């Protein structure tokens, strides 16, 4: 198949290089190269094929080569609407192999703050008993959250952790909270406070 | 242009045989050197390449899977039918159709892709209940309602408030999977406190697996 | 391969201009008259053929070759006035697993005749044992597949062929080229071009009786006498420009610088004056 | 012209780096010789030599043979950046420091 | 299968006829010559894996 790097940095304005290695190359002479661009939640689109050339409708921001075997893509100008994974495909004796990833994180953007929305439950589950209290919090840019969902006990979470990076269009990463409150318990909780810990400001 | 739209039942039991089609316009088949083919994405993986159709009738598929995938062309329709048997829990991910235009050109225009989430699970009722903006999201800045459409296994649920206008201010957050091997969505609004109490808002769930668009607004209580 | 396709063009204009503004066709190796000066030359029947074969057997189209192509599938005579274009054909002619339907002839008992298409297929018995339908060891299926897929580089690709083979001879030319036309001047030595027939003199009415089916006439030798106007459909006479030999009657430099000149061939009205026999 | 000690690779032709797509490109049909020397000996100085600069921020890639010496402030985002040198705003030219 | 041994067969009159006789080969296909034209080219040094 063809190997990919894992991750790439890139500082705003600089140019990097990706790497589409042989591998036990059964390609032969590796003539025809695409590369795309797949962002999270959307369908992947060609950036360059034949990377002699360009298909119409991309910017001179891309261009391609092959030395000997091995085909880089050199993205110059880097800017936040840029972090997508990218593929190298070619034509094997048999199938075309689409190579492995590679995330682009384009690093030197401010820490952003999450703020916290908890949103009241309306009256009609609480009679269907389906106490379901939301503190959906977004808008941060590390990415690495820990609500603390406690009604002045025990903080805990039981189902908050959930992984989401949504690369949006403010490149800012969110969060999904969900609270298991019991129905019958939530007589005795008296409002259920919110406290999210952000990165570096723990607080 | 080339629209390469996808159709076909995303959720299905298992150990059966997908009909995923792939509905092209913009271009004729017959041209010499394109061909239509079809792509697998898998949860947090790479591409793979399943099958892939020409203009002379010819039928390549990967050398992995030949047992099941039987591709077909109707071009009387235009509609590119992609058929595999012997589901397993492993060939769930979102599945695309892109146009080969030549040898040069790999795909070069793509679809927007189909989740086929089959594993053990059949269909699940969403519950819609909207959250009412009260006192505590009005006096927290933006009083931000959201439907709480949950308890459903298919992945693929839109939602839009007050669909055909009001395209931004929905957040859109994909679901979480609790312990009850379900999904849950909690897509609230942007609109600010201005006027929301004398309108009506509601999210347009489409949950299409099940079949069901329950639309239904809320009204401000009071903690 | 085997089935070359063959469709004569005749009665029209070819401006060979628009091939040049087209994909690449870094194959234009006309063994003929000229790639470049082609434009201004009237032909009488072109035949274009075409074909598709790999890319180290192009060479094999020039007139005169071995190898397998140029001797069982496709030969070219040793007296072929024509152009050969090719050009690499690996973007719509392969695809995955190699393309199967292009297929060529390798066994064959004798060697291709020129401009010979052998559509026929029968299993060639290579010795003792005769085969009805069946093949082994003498008996084999003459019409291989090609293979092309798109992982080779360039030697074995899918090589677009097309032959145009040209005949130039004494015949009603009916594939000219874009070249304009002007107004006919009889009475005066002039340059004159019909037909690609270039040639200067002075062109009369003949009273040659011409057949309705013959156009050019020759004298003992093999030069152009008289040329049937293409467009009018009149004869006329090529008689050549005024020439004639120079003499210079000196009587000497020591003595004077006066001379004269003595025009051989000449009667006084197409050069004192003096007329001598 | 005057490079660092880790860029003298770049300079061959078909070669990606910093001073081949801002600085300096040699075009892949390059039909001559490349020379280069060490010269710390006449151009290193103390607390670093800020005579000799290089292109760090470029729209687009340089061209073969081409002698760009502009001075514009790279702009980014969508601000209009006319002078200032803000977070996303920053000077085209860095000074090498040749200690 | 990684111990063959090859025959470097050479100065002789190499006749392909006597290759008939013996049970039906399944595979008699010759990668880059013509089997009908083997009988007629001279060769150096023929090699023979087994």
């Not at chain 2, 679809?111 to 009005?138: D, E, I, M, R």
């Not at chain 2, 897509?187 to 406190?193: D, E, K, L, M, N």
């Not at chain 3, 192009?58 to 152009?83: E, H, M, S």
Request: glycine share 8%; hydrophobic share 30%.
């Amino acid at each position: 198949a063809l190997t990919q790097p894992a991750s790439v940095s890139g500082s705003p304005g600089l140019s990097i290089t990706i790497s589409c290695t042989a591998t036990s190359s059964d390609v032969g002479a590796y003539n025809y190269v695409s590369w795309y661009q797949q962002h999270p939640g959307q369908a992947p689109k060609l950036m360059i094929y034949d990377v002699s050339k360009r298909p119409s409708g991309v910017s001179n921001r891309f261009s391609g080569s092959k030395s000997a075997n091995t085909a880089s893509l050199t993205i110059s100008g880097l800017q936040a609407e840029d972090e997508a994974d990218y593929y190298c495909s070619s034509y094997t004796t048999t199938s075309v192999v689409f190579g492995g990833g590679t995330k682009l994180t384009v690093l030197g953007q401010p820490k952003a703050a999450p703020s916290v929305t908890l949103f009241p439950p309306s009256s009609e589950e609480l009679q269907a008993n389906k106490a379901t209290l939301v503190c959906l919090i977004s808008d941060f840019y590390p990415g690495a959250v820990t609500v603390a969902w406690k009604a002045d006990s025990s903080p805990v979470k039981a189902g908050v952790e959930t992984t989401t990076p949504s690369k949006q269009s403010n490149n800012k990463y969110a969060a999904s909270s969900y609270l298991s409150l019991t129905p019958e318990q939530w007589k005795s909780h008296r409002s259920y406070s919110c406290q999210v810990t952000h990165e570096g400001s723990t607080v | 242009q080339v629209t390469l739209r996808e159709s076909g039942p995303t959720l299905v039991k298992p150990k059966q045989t997908l009909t995923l089609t792939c509905t092209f316009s913009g271009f004729s088949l017959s041209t010499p050197g394109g061909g239509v083919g079809w792509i697998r994405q898998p949860p947090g993986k790479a591409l793979e390449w399943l099958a892939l159709i020409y203009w002379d009738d010819d039928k390549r598929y990967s050398p992995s899977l030949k047992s099941s995938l039987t591709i077909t062309k109707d071009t009387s329709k235009n509609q590119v039918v992609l058929t595999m048997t012997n589901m397993d829990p492993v060939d769930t991910a979102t599945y695309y159709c892109a146009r080969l235009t030549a040898a040069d050109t790999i795909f070069d225009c793509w679809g927007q892709g189909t989740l086929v989430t089959v594993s053990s699970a059949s269909t699940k009722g969403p519950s819609v209940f909207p959250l009412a903006p009260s006192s505590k999201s009005t006096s927290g800045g933006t009083a931000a309602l959201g439907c709480l459409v949950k308890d459903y296994f298919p992945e693929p649920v839109t939602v839009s408030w007050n669909s055909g206008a009001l395209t931004s201010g929905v957040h859109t957050f994909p679901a979480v999977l609790q312990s009850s091997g379900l999904y849950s969505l909690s897509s609230v609004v942007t609109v600010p406190s201005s006027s929301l109490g004398t309108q009506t808002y509601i999210c347009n769930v489409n949950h299409k697996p099940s079949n069901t668009k329950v639309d239904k607004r809320v009204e401000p209580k009071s903690c | 391969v085997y089935a070359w396709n063959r469709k004569r063009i005749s009665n029209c204009v070819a401006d060979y201009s628009v091939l040049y503004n087209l994909a690449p066709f870094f194959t234009f190796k006309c063994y003929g008259v000229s790639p470049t000066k082609l434009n201004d030359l009237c032909f009488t029947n072109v035949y274009a053929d075409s074909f598709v074969i790999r890319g180290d057997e192009v060479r094999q189209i020039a007139p005169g070759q071995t190898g397998n192509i140029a001797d069982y599938n496709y030969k070219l005579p040793d007296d072929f006035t024509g152009c050969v274009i090719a050009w690499n054909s690996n973007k719509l002619d392969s695809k995955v697993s190699g393309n199967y339907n292009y297929l060529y002839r390798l066994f064959r008992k004798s060697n291709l005749k020129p401009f010979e298409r052998d559509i026929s297929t029968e299993i060639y018995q290579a010795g003792n044992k005769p085969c009805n339908g069946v093949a082994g060891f003498n008996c084999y299926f003459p019409l291989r597949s090609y293979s092309f897929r798109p992982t080779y580089g360039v030697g074995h690709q899918p090589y677009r062929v097309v032959v145009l083979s040209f005949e130039l001879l004494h015949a009603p030319a009916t594939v000219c080229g874009p070249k304009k036309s002007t107004n006919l001047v009889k009475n005066k030595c002039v340059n004159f071009n019909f037909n690609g027939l270039k040639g200067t003199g002075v062109l009369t009415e003949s009273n040659k009786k011409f057949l309705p089916f013959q156009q050019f006439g020759r004298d003992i030798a093999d030069t152009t006498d008289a040329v049937r106007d293409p467009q009018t459909l009149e004869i006329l006479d090529i008689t050549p420009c005024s020439f004639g030999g120079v003499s210079v009657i000196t009587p000497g430099t020591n003595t004077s610088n006066q001379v004269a000149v003595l025009y051989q061939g000449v009667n006084c009205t197409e050069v004192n004056v003096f007329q001598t026999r």
